[PDB]
Amino acid sequence: RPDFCLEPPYTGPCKARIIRYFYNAKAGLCQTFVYGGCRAKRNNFKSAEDCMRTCG
Amino acid sequence: RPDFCLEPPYTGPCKARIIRYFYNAKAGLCQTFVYGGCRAKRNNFKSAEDCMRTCG
Amino acid sequence: RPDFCLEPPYTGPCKARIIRYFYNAKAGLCQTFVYGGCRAKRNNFKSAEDCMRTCG
Amino acid sequence: RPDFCLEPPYTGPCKARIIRYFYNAKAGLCQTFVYGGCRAKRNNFKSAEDCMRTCG
Amino acid sequence: RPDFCLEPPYTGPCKARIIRYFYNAKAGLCQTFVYGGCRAKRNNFKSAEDCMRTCG
Amino acid sequence: RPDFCLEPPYTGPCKARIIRYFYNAKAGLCQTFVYGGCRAKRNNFKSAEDCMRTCG
Amino acid sequence: RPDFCLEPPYTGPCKARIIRYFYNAKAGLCQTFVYGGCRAKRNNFKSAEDCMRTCG
Amino acid sequence: RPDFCLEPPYTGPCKARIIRYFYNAKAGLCQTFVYGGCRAKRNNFKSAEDCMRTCG
Amino acid sequence: RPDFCLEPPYTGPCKARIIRYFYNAKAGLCQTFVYGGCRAKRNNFKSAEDCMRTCG
Amino acid sequence: RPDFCLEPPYTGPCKARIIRYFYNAKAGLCQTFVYGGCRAKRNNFKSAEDCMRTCG
């Protein structure tokens, strides 16, 4: 799996509260987290399916 | 039905206010609840259909 | 994980061609499959998120 | 529950193949069925949540 | 039309601000209202189409 | 209500089978119909809410 | 074009902050505006496509 | 407006039947057309809003 | 690519917090940003696909 | 960028016709393609945003 899948989720500085998925290496599962709307990092997926396919 | 379908809904520590479904054993129906966006428990479905099929 | 998560995907007799998720025990990942629109079995999730949470 | 919740699903004369929900009295659950796109009857819900709240 | 179609809209105790439809008997039309995310009453439809078919 | 609200539904020459709403003056309700994807007429709403507000 | 298409956008008394479209006669284009979730006026479309077809 | 807004809609070689919007210079409006799923040209918008804002 | 693709994102005076895409010339990629709901500028796409096609 | 981003799109054996995104290394852009509904490969994103972030 790509290296960025090991990064912890990053909400970023913005103020929106949107749900995104991230690969949780420890649990070996994609989980949700609140993304702020800007300055996203690589371990941030709009679609769960894409999360598990890229990082699972 | 799976045992987690008996757990009460868990909003979690996060600050988003997203609607999700959970199986209400007492009512024998899936209902909505506000999910904060992170650290979800098993009795939490994004889709009502999946809720009633897994827990109903 | 619930036992239905071990069932293979069931398209059913109907004619629609809708994408749904199912837990693929051998891959240990949820994947897509075409659902016909009726007579669904338990290993069939409208949302990938619900799939990995219930069966992952 | 309203009386229409006891009607069996009606696909209708049209040619589209859209998924809709209907209350299956015998199962006491809302399930999917393929709607043709026209001449819908009362036991036909676009949203699973609405189905179980109206008929459940 | 079902009797619940006469109830006025109920936002409920929750804090989310989601748009839902309700049948406005006086106007004989479904209209929107802000649903809080929990403890919904019968006159609350996620889909406008469902509102007008059930109550219209 | 606008005059186009009295026009009957027009599927058009195209081949897609998309659900749209149209105001059925006779029934005094918006209903669904299968739109072909092109050459739409005025009595064609992507949103049921818009149909009933514009023509209802 | 219907006369309501000339009305300026009405947010309404409610507290939700949903995006809707309205026909901006002066720009001769549909644009976005924040709808509060209740007490909507006619120049308020959930779908941009509906706005331009009804008012454009 | 960008020059591509003057191009006529291109369905492409693929077989899907998805609705998209294109700017119709003659009508000075964005309209729908059936996109095949591949080899899209510039005058092809997934969102009506983006169509009218880029080309309108 | 159109010149507006070089403009930095504009959130606008409104108070909604919706995610939109804008072309970031320096990164040569479309990214997200929080849009207020009104007074949008051209480098603002509701769909990421439209973003990269128009500006990429 | 991950290696899978260099793979060409794979429709697969299934019969559904759903649009997905893939990274087109030659064009240095994500584009659409028709996915069959099953047996997906890694260069297949349900969301354009995820595509450009993972592969762009």
From Swiss-Prot, chains A, B, C, D, E, F, G, H, I, J:
It is found in: Secreted. GO terms for biological process: negative regulation of platelet aggregation; negative regulation of serine-type endopeptidase activity; negative regulation of thrombin-activated receptor signaling pathway; trypsinogen activation. One of its GO terms (cellular component) is extracellular space. Inhibits trypsin, kallikrein, chymotrypsin, and plasmin. Disulfide bonds join C5-C55, C14-C38, C30-C51. Its main location: secreted. It comes from the Eukaryota. This is Pancreatic trypsin inhibitor. It comes from Bos taurus (Bovine). Residues 5-55 form the BPTI/Kunitz inhibitor domain. The record marks K15, A16 as: Reactive bond for trypsin. Keywords: Disulfide bond, Pharmaceutical, Protease inhibitor, Secreted, Serine protease inhibitor, Signal. The chain holds residues 36 to 91 of 100 of the full protein. GO terms for molecular function: calcium ion binding; molecular function inhibitor activity; potassium channel inhibitor activity; protease binding; serine-type endopeptidase inhibitor activity; sulfate binding; zymogen binding. Transmembrane segments: none annotated.
